[PDB]
Design a protein around this ligand. Structure first.
Ligand SMILES: *[C@@H]1O[C@H](CO)[C@@H](O)[C@H](O)[C@H]1NC(C)=O
Length: 982
């Protein structure tokens, strides 16, 4: 109604061709509700585009306001008129089912009058299309003959499709559905759908009786049969519906797999990165390392955590074995890789690994068969990188955007290292080098930058770092494009002279280190300059700078490379020891730049080692949880130089090694953390709010409701973040509106660089938004619409995380959830399977003294308490009940005193079943392992935890409570004095 497309098209038809796109996007309304005076600030074009945008937006705004004021009534009772869009730019189909039957055969049967017949059987695919088999025959006597296409029309009449959410969190009530399609023109199917029982979730079909429904599907129509399942188990479980048609013989039934995940958000934490050099660090040829247990403070109740320890026989072994392989190469980092620079995972790690293995010659024992695989990986990576190449021989950060000098230099540096491996086109690299030298170099010897910055930048210490980086890039292509590009040595000399001229005024550690490495490559690192390089190191162990974490790692890598270029082997071992330590995220490093720089520095150190050898590590692990001692020996010419061990419990152990080498140890733990807003955000301030959509407007047919998610983020630092990323994890059944994201990205305004809906997202669907920068002065806000397709109750909150790519230390996490609780399935049996947990099978209404005595202190039970409720802290996922201990009938593995306080944590689904109240007395007994605290000493209301509401003393005199007060008192006295007979 409010689109008003006709006059929009009319106005656009009266503008020049180049200005049509500028005005077309000036009329469509963005979801953030921005007046076009503010929107014009985001237009990265000329003043003509800004003027046209502003004029068109004001015109259409006034026009549509008048239309909505005149022809819209709130009491009309007549539906608003809808106009067909009648758009242009229509795109033809481009997705067709993949081809099959890619096999060759030779006819060998005895010919009959020249014709040889061969009978071949094929298995038709499950696509409802019409295949066209194409046959071509080759014979040495007659030649090539092309047969006519053969048409195989696959058809079906009744189709059952089972609609499921991607993943439903445990203890979430979700309505999966089965859609039955009838394709008969004038026939009505009479199907008998049935839901098979599954132990994992209590369907409406109990084990005693299966659930069957007879539904009639109208001709040329479809019917949806909704089902409700609540999952109480984790993993992947099968949902099956069996449908049998009447009088049509069709018995089609569809089975699908549903993934159910714990309530929290899975995280990987590093607890130990200790190096292994017993010859020097150890006491006397023996090293002892004490490994503390992981924190696991915020672990989600009833969720197992797995700890893994990895033994490196070489500081470079893990990255090498990861880079050579394909399915594991993507795990070197923990960040997305969808832009210009981050797309170097395919090329740089594999290139460095291949070069290091070649110059060390470890292929004979590692396996020469893998080299071709690595080459293929590099080829694929190179094929991807050409997507970012502008026609002007320059590489841009994103597709079809301003070319970046820094990225072009990095690409040239990586390409110059791979010509000896794969068939890198010389035209591309030479054109990039020529572009860098001609169009971006100032006469003074400084490389200009015009595109928005990607890394961290009188303009001093900014041009120095960029010039040093570009010089390091050019020194790799010195002998490659020397013939196509002539003035390269002059540019290198000018850049080196400029670097030497202003090298004494540097103050930051990063610029000092990078300029020192550039000079050491050029050979000008001599005299007082060398002293400036050495004195910058703090503790003679690192080129550290306060605040920055990954930049410090990169600068230390540059310094180590410079030291190697200086042919020094005394100041290096401390730097190598420090660099092997800073593995914060997972088992390795976070970003790509720091990872690649450490890889390069360590590989260079290993290459120039004076035949170090002496790799005879023998690591003995004394795990308290295991009676038998664990031992691994890693000698030279071993199989993989990597040894991994796994544990299902959190504990601290000790590591013993006997020397003869320099190994590394890394311990990482995997667990789930409760959905709580991060207490302290290092540098980003984030606020995320989800609200119902003011008007339905355009909604997908399947979507049940639409909501608007609005995110506002700001950078608390002095300068804008170099590059930042929004990782948005979404609740069950929710999908974003792709039209809004496309409008945000592709539009002239370009609020977001690009969006990516495809990731691993093993837990829940994730959306990644690449923000070019975050403004420190004011909040940067963006909003888009998310639609729900499956209705859900007790829905868990979603997470939004904003972090700087090149420095992952500065990240902020927030949680959003739509605004007692209401369920959707309370029936005779469905309300009981959900509530079957957190309680015992007793109904707490007909409790007998004998039954209570028998079930009170069963050998499984290890504690029985009589406490009082202090307060109720109801939360989104787990409720907190702080119980004041009144008297402990018996004591177990946990020590308490009268008057002390404890806290019990209960699942949200059991809030109504518990129905606890303020300032009331209760009696609970439970198992021995029902203690959660390691301090807090929290307890979990499990399946063997009893809850009885102790009547108040003044209310014990009523008819409905005197029958129970005396029984409870007698029971308590009997167990206090007489104890348990059994
Ligand atoms: C956590 O670390 C382990 C051990 O290195 C790894 O297998 C796992 O993939 C990592 N994280 C996740 C979220 O799976």
């Amino acid at each position: 109604s409010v689109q008003l497309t006709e006059k929009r098209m009319d106005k656009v038809g009266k503008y020049p061709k180049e200005l049509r796109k500028c005005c077309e996007d000036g009329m469509r309304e963005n979801p953030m509700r921005f007046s076009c005076q503010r929107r014009t600030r985001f237009i990265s074009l000329g003043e003509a585009c800004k003027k046209v945008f502003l004029d068109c937006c004001n015109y259409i705004t006034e026009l549509r306001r008048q239309h909505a004021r005149a022809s819209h009534l709130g009491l009309a009772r007549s539906n608003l008129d809808e106009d067909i869009i009648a758009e242009e730019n229509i795109v033809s189909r481009s997705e067709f089912p993949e081809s099959w039957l890619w096999n060759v055969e030779d006819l060998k049967e005895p010919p009959k009058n020249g014709i040889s017949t061969k009978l071949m059987n094929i298995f038709l695919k499950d696509s409802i299309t019409t295949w066209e088999i194409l046959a071509v025959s080759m014979s040495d006597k007659k030649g090539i003959c092309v047969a006519d296409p053969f048409e195989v029309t696959v058809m079906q009449d009744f189709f059952i499709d089972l609609r499921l959410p991607y993943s439903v969190v445990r203890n979430e009530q979700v309505e999966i559905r089965a859609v039955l399609y009838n394709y008969r023109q004038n026939q009505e199917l009479k199907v008998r759908v049935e839901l098979l029982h599954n132990p994992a979730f209590c369907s409406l079909a109990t084990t005693k009786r299966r659930h069957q429904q007879t539904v009639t599907i109208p001709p040329k129509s479809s019917l949806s049969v909704p089902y409700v399942i609540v999952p109480l188990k984790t993993g992947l479980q099968e949902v099956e519906v069996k449908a049998a048609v009447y009088h049509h013989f069709i018995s089609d039934g569809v089975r699908k797999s549903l993934k159910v995940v714990p309530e929290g958000i899975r995280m990987n934490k590093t607890v130990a990165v200790r190096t292994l050099d017993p010859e020097r660090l150890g006491r006397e040829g023996v090293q002892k390392e004490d490994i503390p247990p992981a924190d696991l403070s915020d672990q989600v109740p009833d969720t197992e955590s797995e700890t893994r320890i990895l033994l490196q026989g070489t500081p470079v072994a893990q990255m090498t074995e990861d880079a050579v392989d394909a399915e594991r190469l993507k795990h070197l980092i923990v960040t997305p890789s969808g832009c210009g620079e981050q797309n170097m995972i395919g090329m740089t790690p594999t290139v460095i690994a291949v070069h290091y293995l070649d110059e060390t010659e470890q292929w004979e024992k590692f396996g020469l068969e893998k080299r071709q695989g690595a080459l293929e990986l590099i080829k694929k990576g190179y094929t991807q990188q050409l997507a970012f190449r502008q026609p002007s021989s320059a590489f841009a950060a994103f597709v079809k955007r301003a070319p970046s000098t820094w990225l072009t230099a990095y690409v040239v540096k990586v390409f110059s290292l791979a010509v000896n491996l794969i068939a890198i086109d010389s035209q591309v690299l030479c054109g990039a080098v020529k572009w860098l030298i001609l169009e971006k170099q100032k006469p003074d010897g400084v490389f200009q930058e015009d595109a928005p910055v990607i890394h961290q930048e009188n303009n001093n210490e900014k041009d120095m770092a960029l010039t040093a980086f570009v010089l390091i890039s050019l020194q790799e292509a010195k002998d490659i494009c020397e013939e196509q590009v002539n003035s390269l040595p002059g540019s290198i000399t000018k850049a080196g002279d400029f670097l030497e001229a202003n090298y004494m005024n540097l103050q930051r550690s990063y610029t000092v280190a990078i300029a020192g490495y550039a000079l050491a490559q050029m050979g000008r690192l001599k005299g007082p300059l060398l002293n400036k390089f050495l004195t910058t190191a703090k503790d003679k162990n690192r080129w550290e700078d306060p605040g920055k974490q990954l930049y410090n790692v990169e600068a230390t890598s540059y310094a180590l490379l410079a030291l190697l270029q200086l042919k020094d082997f005394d100041f290096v071992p401390p730097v190598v020891r420090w660099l092997n330590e800073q593995r914060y995220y997972g088992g390795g490093y976070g970003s790509t730049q720091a990872t690649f720089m450490v890889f390069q520095a360590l590989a260079q150190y290993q290459k120039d080692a004076p035949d170090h050898q002496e790799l005879n590590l023998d690591v003995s692990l004394q795990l308290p949880s295991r009676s038998s001692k664990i031992t691994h020996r890693i000698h030279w010419e071993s199989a993989s130089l990597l040894r991994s061990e796994e544990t299902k419990e959190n504990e601290g152990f000790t590591v013993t090694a006997e020397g003869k080498g320099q190994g590394t140890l890394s311990v990482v733990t995997m667990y789930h953390a409760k959905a709580k807003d991060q207490l302290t955000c290092n540098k980003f301030d984030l606020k995320v709010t989800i609200k119902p959509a003011p008007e339905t407007e355009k909604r997908p047919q399947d979507a049940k409701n639409t909501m608007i998610l609005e995110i506002c983020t700001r950078y608390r630092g002095d300068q804008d973040a170099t590059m930042s990323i929004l990782d948005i994890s979404m609740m069950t059944g929710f999908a974003p509106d792709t039209d809004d994201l496309k409008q945000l990205a592709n539009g002239v305004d370009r609020y977001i660089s690009k969006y990516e809906l495809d990731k691993a997202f093993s837990d829940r669907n994730t959306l990644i938004i690449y923000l070019d920068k975050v403004s420190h002065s004011e909040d940067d806000c963006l909003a888009f619409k998310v639609h729900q397709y499956f209705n859900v109750e007790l829905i868990q909150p979603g997470a939004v995380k904003v972090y700087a790519y090149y420095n992952l230390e500065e990240s902020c996490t927030r949680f959003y959830h739509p605004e007692g609780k209401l369920n959707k399935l309370c029936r005779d049996e469905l309300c009981r399977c959900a509530e079957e947990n957190c309680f015992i099978q007793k109904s707490d209404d007909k409790v007998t003294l004998e039954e209570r005595l028998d079930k009170a202190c069963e050998p499984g039970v290890d504690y029985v308490y009589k406490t009082r409720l202090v307060k109720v802290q109801l939360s989104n996922d787990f409720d907190e009940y702080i119980m004041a201990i009144e008297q402990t009938i018996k004591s177990g593995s946990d020590e308490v005193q009268v008057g002390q306080q404890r806290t019990f944590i209960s699942p949200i689904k059991c809030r109504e079943a518990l129905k606890l109240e303020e300032k009331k007395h209760y009696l609970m007994w439970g198992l021995s392992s029902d203690f959660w605290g390691e301090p807090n000493l929290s307890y979990i209301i499990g399946k063997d935890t009893w809850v009885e509401h102790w009547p108040e003393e003044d209310e014990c005199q009523d008819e409905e409570n005197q029958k129970q007060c005396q029984d409870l008192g007698a029971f308590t006295e009997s167990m206090v004095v007489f104890g348990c007979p059994n």
